[PDB]
Symmetry: D2
Subunit: 295 residues, 4 copies
């Protein structure tokens, strides 16, 4: 037997950082969950019980807190690139670092119409994520994402003209509920190293904001022919607005809301045009994916 | 052996309702999870296998959807009172109905600064809940609550002057992070029946909004001496603003953020005045409760 | 305003303890999650910012680890009673301690048909729980429970003869699937104090084992007329076997498995006697409770 | 813009099947959660709102229940291969089916030392999984796995001789707790099609049982030098026992149990040789992976 692939490190490292402006008194908080996995010349830890090649996972955890102390933690694309670069520069035998960051929302509170200097609310479990792969001699590959964005529209969704055969019971419809949890990933052009990531820093927050805005507006305004057709329109607009993105990937569940036939009870009308009360279905769910790139 | 207490019914009934304004084209959605448990002269179903006394839980589920079709589902205090009253009026041998409703957020989307007519976002897992107990000859008891409101302040929290003995390691502090998940319940005066609940309908949404606003403002502005002292100030203000509330109960976890001593690494200063990077603790957590009523 | 009720303490305290037999080399592990909440003369911490009455929740956490170091942690009824008694004896102004313990399974591994001296497996998320209320001058009240015991029988469950009216769609059946998650609680006679709890120590593990065995055998062997009727038979047998129990409470969800009509597809027969493939329903679920006590 | 990749289908399809032996009266239940995603000539559903290429996800769901009615559902490697093959044979424009199955435990109850004919218990959240990729002209690729197997050993784990630098605080140890949740995957040789999968049917259950037994015995008996070294010994033995496996992948969290220094309290000794009470850590956790293949 041989080791074909190996990676190890620390998962679920919770980090909070506060920035205090001495001038204004305004405080800004950042909270993330970090995972760092390393690869390199470590096979002998598996095959020969040779721990001399292991950077302890406890040390990786210490490194994350030290790196957060000495560097900006925003945008997460930059923090992840700094953290990944650290390992491949510090350790001769480590050739790849894989950094995953989940950013949690702490939104400044408005009290009496004024932004509060040091009070925050978690307005939704929506996340902003980054996956950073730092590979010796191959640069920095960054995938940015938003996830956990849960939306619903109560009309202006259709689904008709699909394949009908002896397995088909679904009725065609010209008016349904559409609800999903949005997972959207944009993959950046390969960066040569940290200097190039630093040169593009302003584009990271702006592209996240554009991806979010395009997703919400397209969902709200599209008279949707299908999840497939609406998600393609989203991906096409993101690629049009940011030339440094190579691909956009959406993964969308179709969270079903079923009509309830109440006609058995006193002829109550609750289907088609008369549908008011629906049963949200926990499972099963449609799952629709696509990856859109340049011609 | 004897049956000392018995209740049964249907839990986890998901309901969606849409309201369509024909004039404006504007649609409003409501989504809830409902539980109905009944009590009454049902002991023989347990002791003698006498199913003749059982209103099937499947029928309770049907009743919830029919009631939602024929009645307003907002405010939830009113819907729960209608649903509970139904069972004790329809079934001679049912003497109490217990209705629990969890209301899920569907917040209208703003697209290009305008409210969208039919598109919604789940802005946070915060819930608005109601517990309604309808008891034959004893009226309607309503407990209203908000839950899952997650907040953090990065300064203006203290904790000193507590009991110190041979079990104590905690250092006194004049500047810490305070973060909690707010669970707040207000208990209404007993109502004689549905006519009296209907007479107070406007107070339900207004009191929920006041409870939320008082919680957020007091949390943000109090230079907190303890969770205990801040939560009492919240409860006292709610009771002052709504005379039809008898009691206010808060249940608050103290979600700890620990300083990280980095002085072992190149004398890095990250404690006290120099604290920037903290470790959020998943467990354990402080849990602080109180119930505040009138003199 | 006045404080009507107040309790505070530490939740989610994870504890592991190992016992090492020097003779045999055999090791036994215990893992629990503990919550301790205190009550007493503490109103001024809420009303006057008087922290002098507060035993810090951090100190409660330290106390749990010290108590586990110096005492047996099994049976949990005894450990909880020791821990609760500690607070009301140590602190003059604390008059009640509320101790909740969840015990996690670590079952010794069998390797090559022999019990392993120091290797364990988590065989199911079933828990053994205790709730201990220690109240100055009122003794020790103990509720013991098992929870998370998930069972299914594929036949020998019926449900017919229930109330039928204009809300009813459910068909009567003489052969269905019955599946539940068992939550069973037995409430002990009030104990005068720790000496009396110690005098009954052997009864705690034996009664837990009897409750489990009676639940499993009755579920498996009863040709069930309803959840109501089967759960009553369980409670009646537990009360018959342990005279120091006052009440037994069961809380049982009815986890529905629905027939799937496939007759639309090539006349496939999959209902009634021909039912082979079913759709487990995640929600909604029946919820059936009862409390059984002595004549 | 262009579609670079697309797949869609139905997730979270819960299925139960019962087998009834008329001779013996013995019933056997199977419960799974199924996901089917399709790929093929479907780009126009995304780009042109052309639904004519879409096999509705609702139809995929119907197909899973019909396939379960007409075929064995065990071993899951066979069921997944039948289900995947169906789509690429039935639909000219579908060129790949991706089938994921999670099998839930329903273990026959022993009542009074005898196996019960129709009563089952969920003994742990351990799963048996299959991933089946059926690709037109490329055969059937099967990955089998077990997941959610949670184990702990209280001694006979060491970790010393790792890299020490200015980021390192971890002390070397010759005696620690080791606890993990095992995720183990074995990848079969490519199969030409369903006839070849059928020819190997007996090997699927036997290899699952061998993988489980090797994992448990190696964990229990290895005087572990590291997670890395113990997991390699597991993978090497599985590959030795089944020639039709190409690779074995383990993914193991290192679930930390920390010593608690109690020496501040009356000189209590609870570290090193005197360690009895530990604090299980929920996060962070080590994460160790490896893939082992043939020379
Ligand atoms: O078994 C282990 N492997 C590691 O890589 C490691 N790092 N810290 N502790 C550890 N334990
Ligand atoms: O056992 C049951 N009890 C009930 O109360 C019930 N109601 N519907 N189905 C049911 N099954
Ligand atoms: O606000 C607080 N209240 C308490 O009771 C406490 N105990 N430890 N820390 C604490 N903080
Ligand atoms: O938008 C949809 N896409 C699909 O692929 C589908 N299948 N069933 N319903 C559906 N809705
Ligand atoms: Ar969509
Ligand atoms: Ar608070
Ligand atoms: Ar039952
Ligand atoms: Ar291991
Ligand atoms: Na390197
Ligand atoms: Na009545
Ligand atoms: Na006392
Ligand atoms: Na094909």
């Amino acid at each position: 037997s041989a080791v074909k692939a190996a990676r190890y490190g620390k998962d679920n490292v919770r980090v909070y950082k506060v920035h205090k402006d001495e001038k204004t008194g305004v405080q800004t908080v950042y909270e993330m969950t970090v995972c760092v996995l390393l690869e390199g010349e470590i096979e002998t830890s598996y095959t020969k019980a040779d721990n001399s090649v292991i950077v302890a996972t406890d040390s990786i955890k210490n490194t994350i807190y030290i790196t957060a102390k000495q560097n900006p933690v925003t945008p997460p694309e930059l923090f992840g690139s700094i953290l990944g670069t650290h390992f491949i520069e510090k350790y001769n035998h480590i050739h790849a670092a894989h950094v995953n960051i989940v950013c949690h929302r702490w939104t400044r509170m408005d009290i009496d119409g004024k932004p509060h200097p040091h009070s925050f609310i978690r307005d939704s479990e929506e996340k902003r994520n980054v996956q950073v792969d730092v590979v010796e001699g191959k640069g920095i590959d960054i995938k940015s994402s938003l996830s956990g964005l849960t939306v619903l529209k109560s009309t202006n969704s259709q689904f008709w003209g699909f394949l009908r055969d002896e397995y088909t019971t679904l009725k065609e419809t010209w008016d349904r509920i559409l609800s999903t949890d949005v997972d959207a990933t944009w993959q950046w052009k390969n960066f040569s190293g940290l200097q190039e990531v630093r040169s593009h820093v302003p584009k990271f927050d702006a592209t996240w904001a554009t991806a979010r805005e395009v997703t919400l507006k397209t969902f709200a305004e599209d008279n949707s022919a299908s999840v497939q057709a609406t998600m393609y329109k989203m991906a096409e607009q993101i690629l049009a607005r940011q030339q440094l993105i190579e691909t956009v990937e959406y993964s969308l569940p179709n969270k079903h809301y079923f009509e309830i036939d109440l006609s058995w009870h006193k002829g109550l009308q609750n289907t088609g045009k008369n549908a008011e009360v629906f049963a949200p279905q926990s499972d099963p769910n449609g799952l629709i994916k696509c990856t859109v790139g340049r011609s």
